[PDB]
Amino acid sequence: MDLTNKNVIFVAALGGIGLDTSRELVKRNLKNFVILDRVENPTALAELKAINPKVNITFHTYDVTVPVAESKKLLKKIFDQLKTVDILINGAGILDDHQIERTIAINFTGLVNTTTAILDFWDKRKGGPGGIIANICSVTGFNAIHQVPVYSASKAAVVSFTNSLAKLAPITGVTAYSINPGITRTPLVHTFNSWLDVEPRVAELLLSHPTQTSEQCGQNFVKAIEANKNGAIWKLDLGTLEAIEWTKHWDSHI
Amino acid sequence: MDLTNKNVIFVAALGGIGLDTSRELVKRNLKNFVILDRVENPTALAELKAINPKVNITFHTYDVTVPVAESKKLLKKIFDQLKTVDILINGAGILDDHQIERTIAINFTGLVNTTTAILDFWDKRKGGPGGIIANICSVTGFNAIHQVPVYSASKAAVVSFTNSLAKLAPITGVTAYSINPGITRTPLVHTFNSWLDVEPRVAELLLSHPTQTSEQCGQNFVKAIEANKNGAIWKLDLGTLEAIEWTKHWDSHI
């Protein structure tokens, strides 16, 4: 994927990983960069515009917990305006195992719903051109942080969902791959709640081991986008980019 | 685990796999078998009761999508009657990828919430006796049926959650293991809805490959319960019982 002249929608572009990925994206000479996030951040918008005045950057308020119809309404308008969209990045996430329902709603259900919505405009069975989805999952979807079992389980769900999307690409025209950061220094991880307070010290302990910065993560994220490998399961950990091989424990044979 | 004289709560005990498992459980001379299901099944309830009239079988209507506090109220009623509960089996599930929110609510969120509720009675940090949780997940949580990506993702989530519960046993006193059936001739797999109708004939296709009987599955289910291995990931496929080894792609170090 040569990002030159492409149109990208990024859900949750303005958080820690999001914004460092966005900084790198706009260095690539996109035609349109459409940010969908819960709250507007004018400072970050100014920053992106200063990095590359050539990119047309637009913002829309978007909360992934809205019903699928509301996502369809917003996406319909963006597709109308732009005519085409090349890539959707689903980046929304929270880390708070005191918020069981909301963790699941944001990290799993919301991602599934934005995906379901955009298929209205991309699905080749409806006359669309197909497209590409990059889902921000997590290494915790491979192997949990067991002190945040709900968070980790929500990420295991979206790892699986993404794998399935990629296997459905011949039918829908929509390829997909997962972006799975290891521990990355952002507001997500500095202080957070463990399930039933099993480990009050969970952030302190987690951060006592090697990590990466959001800049490193963002750099490797855009490299993964540029590789453009349907079904890839990218690990972005300790400043490197690696594709992992999913174990075949079982096969449906369909 | 010697089931003799034990007290078991089984959520979703009278459906396809649940009922054969239930038949095998009550042959083992439980003291109490408490069934919590959304729908009454008098015929099924009568058969079970007749197998071993000595066993006390109690049914309570239970919807796993209710809030945690409602689950706690029901569990308090059961604990007040029984005083102790040895095993909780979480078996609720639907398969219908036209019902995205409800799939996630039943298959993932509800299992998490029933678990969260029973921890109030078992958590050793509050003076509880600990306990055992058997979660009915699915081989699809290892490798999806990609034509039902939402179902499969919900199952990946509960495989992960169960792994994490087991790792938390030192803290809570609550051991756990997953039971992961392969394709089993039962009715969930009768005619079902694929995500965005990518494959109208998933059931027909699944059954065009070797499968197992629900009798076979129930027999192996009870063997797994008797093995009582914290952190086991049991595959119940093609008539066998096998513990699988989870791939270590990443480690939190905590």
Ligand SMILES: NC(=O)c1ccc[n+]([C@@H]2O[C@H](COP(=O)([O-])OP(=O)(O)OC[C@H]3O[C@@H](n4cnc5c(N)ncnc54)[C@H](O)[C@@H]3O)[C@@H](O)[C@H]2O)c1
């Ligand atoms: N930081 C890490 O170590 C790490 C590791 C692996 C995966 N992740 C994932 O990366 C993604 C970004 O995390 P981050 O570390 O930058 O955290 P962050 O808190 O800085 O950013 C969270 C992002 O999600 C958005 N978001 C949250 N709730 C939303 C909602 N209801 N609707 C729309 N957007 C919403 C926020 O506005 C923000 O853009 C998340 O999916 C997170 O789970 C983080």
Ligand SMILES: NC(=O)c1ccc[n+]([C@@H]2O[C@H](COP(=O)([O-])OP(=O)(O)OC[C@H]3O[C@@H](n4cnc5c(N)ncnc54)[C@H](O)[C@@H]3O)[C@@H](O)[C@H]2O)c1
């Ligand atoms: N059948 C298979 O091939 C297969 C394979 C692997 C895993 N599973 C899992 O095994 C478990 C049982 O599957 P089955 O084949 O017996 O299907 P089934 O449809 O025959 O049984 C489903 C059970 O879940 C219960 N349930 C549904 N919604 C509920 C709710 N809201 N609250 C409480 N209970 C609810 C139903 O009452 C029923 O008892 C499910 O978790 C299923 O996902 C099935």
